[PDB]
Write a protein that binds this ligand. Structure first.
Ligand code: OAN
Ligand code: 7NT
Ligand code: CA
Length: 671
């Protein structure tokens, strides 16, 4: 399965052996990056002057003169041919020759090649990744690995813009990088060049930019220093800011000044990109004229970025036409998937889908904003590479499977099993959701409905759930010990542990359904209660980021199933044996005398939108939005302050175990 799929492919069902004795033509004329790949594949084979002919070169080189007519007349296009007597690897330009070898490398298997002819080129001019998320920026090693990944998948763009890089954004975007960070960026650029990737360095100055000569000159001085480090593509982001930086007339003038005094003065600058302050339809001004101002003032060579109809959205034909009408050029798509910086307790490992596949001519570029987990993002990145290169033939599910088999061949099935149940985002402010657990959902929904209303469940559906849980446990244990992609495993391990505990809980709950006798049921009940507590421990000790801490997995279908089956069967037990077992499904060490479950997040205890803690803690503050004690007997009332329904008051380290109130709701304690 060639990825991305070529534009034109003719196979003959007739295999050739990689020439043991070959004759290379064009080694000095062709792209050095391509020739190096070629000679890696040919090492061990002899280079003579009367063997099989292998011709490599760009349009214009002597080596591929005979094949001029076969080379497509497109940027980054190429022509590949394998048959009995010769091999031809001929790009329209140097990058086309490199991409010819990346396809050649996939055809080579077991030392054999198929007799084939390919004419290929991209449907979208700029294709790649923008590291533009909030959170821990990608490590240096992760970025080196990404750049090699892009080259293999014909992605030609890496836009560097981590929101939390202080020399990229507020306040030190005026400062050059320190020597150590500068030497790393220098290495990234060299590696990006080796893989035919345009390293685009972006700057995010709009929050405190002043529209005067001082800051303008400092922005250009920063760009000049990046240029000295090898950067040849540049971007200016004006997203997620307020104040004077949001002025469209000023933004355009600044980028036109950069164009004329910098990008037009250098001999070798490629991409110049800007991200508007209004970067999606929902948040644009209907009264105002922000986008039309940018469209008319910005020089035509400058790209404008756009995330679609909303911050998180799929790109449609109606949405791309809406924006292009206003910016007077094809939009440079910034696709906010699989980025998870607003649902950081979730991994988004599902397939890439939703984007119209007939609008290649309507977009100038397409970049994906990934997760801060670099390797885990390779599933979607690989799929975006396929989509952007050949939208007409984009196969969502087949490309998802191909990505997984490339990222972890030694345990692809195990990773597919894990990814299938780690795709949805759970409820979020954007209302953006993805499918998850689709294969087992029919059985789960029929099993639970028959269960709640006293019918009979199909034994086949029951064994499907047993099969699923068993397979989940196999995949978790195999993935935990996989040493083929250690960075990947480190990223996902907290979720893999939570994944396994879910599976184990599911099996014990199903054993509670089979029932048998009273003591066995109680054994299973106690084991489930212990597994709940173990999942709480992980949720409180792993991935303790300051936004959505903890670890959530299989949230769309499987976890709801298990929790509602446990609740139901415990209810039937209490009715049958006149018991009072606890039917709650999430462990909580604190207690409130409402049906709203308390939640623990970092050092906060909150009521879901009188309390007794499991111990005494020093108090920080309370935040209610519409009295305290240590032993339950003696209380010490406290007063509140107010703004727009924001109640609050500091406790000043006073011991607290009890809280009460009578006439959203959070208690912060010291840890
Ligand atoms: C263009 C863009 O997507 N900007 C940021 C981004 N901004 O979206 C917002 O959340 N915008 C916003 C929301 C509330 C208040 C102000 C800005 O979306 C991505 C996913 O969150 C972030 O990674 C990007 O850095
Ligand atoms: C947990 C810390 C957190 O929420 N970080 C975060 N901040 C964002 N910004 C802050 C600046 O103004 C815009 C909102 C943000 C946007 C999208 S995801 C994200 N995370
Ligand atoms: Ca050449």
């Amino acid at each position: 399965s060639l990825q991305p799929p070529p534009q034109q492919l003719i196979v003959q069902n007739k295999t050739i052996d990689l020439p043991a004795v070959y004759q290379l033509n064009g080694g000095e004329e062709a792209n050095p990056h391509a020739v190096k790949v070629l000679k890696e594949l040919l090492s061990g084979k002899q280079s003579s002057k009367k063997g099989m002919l292998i011709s490599i070169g760009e349009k214009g080189d002597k080596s591929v003169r005979k094949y001029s007519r076969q080379i497509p007349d497109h940027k980054e296009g190429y022509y590949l041919s394998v048959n009995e007597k010769e091999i031809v690897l001929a790009g329209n330009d140097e990058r086309g020759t490199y991409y010819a070898l990346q396809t050649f490398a996939q055809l080579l298997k077991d030392g054999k090649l198929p007799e084939v002819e390919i004419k290929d080129y991209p449907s979208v001019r700029y294709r790649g990744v923008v590291e533009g998320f909030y959170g821990t920026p990608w490590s240096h090693q992760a970025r080196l690995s990404q750049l090699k990944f892009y080259g293999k998948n014909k992605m030609n763009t890496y836009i560097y813009g981590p929101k939390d890089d202080p020399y990229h954004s507020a306040p030190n975007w005026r400062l050059p990088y320190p020597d150590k960070e500068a030497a790393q960026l220098q290495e990234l650029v060299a590696v990006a060049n080796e893989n035919e990737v345009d390293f685009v360095w972006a700057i995010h100055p709009g929050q405190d930019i002043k529209w005067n000569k001082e800051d303008r000159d400092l922005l250009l001085a920063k760009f000049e220093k990046m240029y000295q480090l090898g950067v040849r593509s540049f971007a200016v982001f004006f997203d997620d800011i307020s104040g004077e930086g949001t002025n469209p007339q000023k933004q355009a003038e600044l980028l036109n000044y950069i164009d004329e005094k910098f990008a037009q003065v250098k001999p070798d600058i490629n991409q110049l990109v800007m991200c508007p302050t209004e970067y999606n339809k929902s948040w644009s001004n209907p009264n105002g004229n922000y986008l039309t101002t940018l469209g008319d003032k910005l020089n035509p060579s400058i790209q404008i970025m756009w995330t679609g109809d909303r911050v998180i959205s799929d790109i449609t034909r109606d949405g791309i036409s809406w924006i292009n009408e206003r910016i007077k050029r094809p939009a440079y798509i910034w696709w906010n998937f699989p980025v998870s910086d607003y649902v950081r307790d979730h991994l988004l490992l599902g397939p890439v889908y939703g984007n119209d596949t007939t609008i290649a001519k309507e977009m100038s570029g397409f970049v994906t904003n990934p997760m801060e987990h670099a390797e885990s993002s390779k599933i979607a990145i690989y799929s975006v590479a396929s989509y952007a290169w050949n939208p007409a033939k984009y196969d969502t599910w087949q490309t998802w499977k191909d990505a997984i088999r490339t990222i972890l061949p030694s345990a692809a099935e195990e990773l597919e099993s894990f990814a299938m149940h780690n795709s949805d985002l759970g409820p979020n402010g954007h209302g953006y959701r993805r499918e998850e657990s689709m294969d087992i959902q029919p059985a789960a929904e029929r099993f639970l409905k028959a269960f709640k209303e006293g019918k009979n469940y199909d034994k086949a559906d029951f064994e499907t759930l047993q099969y699923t849980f068993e397979r989940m446990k196999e995949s978790a244990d195999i993935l935990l010990m996989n040493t083929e992609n250690k960075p990947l495993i480190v990223e996902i391990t907290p979720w893999v542990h939570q994944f396994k505990l879910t599976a184990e809980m599911g099996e014990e709950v199903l054993k509670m359904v089979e029932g048998r006798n009273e003591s066995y049921f109680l054994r299973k009940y106690n084991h489930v209660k212990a597994l709940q507590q173990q999942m709480f421990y992980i949720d409180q000790t792993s991935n303790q980021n300051p936004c959505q801490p903890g670890v959530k997995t299989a949230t769309r279908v499987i976890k709801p199933l298990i929790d509602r089956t446990f609740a139901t069967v415990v209810k039937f037990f209490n009715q049958k044996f006149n018991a009072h077992l606890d039917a709650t499904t999430d462990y909580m060490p604190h207690k409130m005398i409402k049906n709203l479950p308390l939640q623990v997040k970092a050092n906060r205890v909150l009521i879901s939108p009188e309390i007794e803690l499991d111990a005494i803690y020093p108090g920080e503050n309370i935040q209610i939005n519409f009295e305290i004690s240590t032993d339950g007997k003696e209380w010490k009332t406290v007063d509140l302050k107010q703004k727009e329904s924001r109640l609050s008051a500091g406790l000043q380290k006073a011991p607290v175990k009890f809280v009460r109130f009578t006439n959203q709701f959070v208690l912060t304690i010291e840890k």
